[PDB]
Amino acid sequence: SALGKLQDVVNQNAQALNTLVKQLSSNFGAISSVLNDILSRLDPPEAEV
Amino acid sequence: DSFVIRGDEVRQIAPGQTGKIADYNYKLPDDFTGCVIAWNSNNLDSKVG
Incomplete structure (x- = not known):
């Protein structure tokens, strides 16, 4: 969980695209x-x- | 536009209708603006034979 700040942004963008x-x-x-x-x-x- | 049709075919003189009259005789557009006026003419357009 060291790089969780970048992974949160990546997961939010991918999840928004998946919802769309x-x-x-x-x-x-x-x-x-x-x-x-x-x-x-x-x-x-x-x-x- | 004036013509004579059958009594139960007045339903087909409307936008979006299907039948012998709409498809083969008189087609109205889907964007039609105007008035469709019909009346019975049995005493004028019917003969005994």
Whole structure:
């Protein structure tokens, strides 16, 4: 634990990037988190929503 | 734009609709602005034969 100050910064940056990646898997109330599934399953009037 | 359609096909004269009338006869855009006015003309456009 001698170099914990640099490792904390590295871990915070990597964990923030990982959280920003994992936010793509959330649908945020939509039917799916994948744009291709929405564009292939629905017409553009509801796929727009 | 004036025409004559079937009674239960007035549902299809709207943006984003599907059917024989919307897809093959009269397509409205998704960004349509205007008014769709319809009325029964059975006493004018129907004959006994």
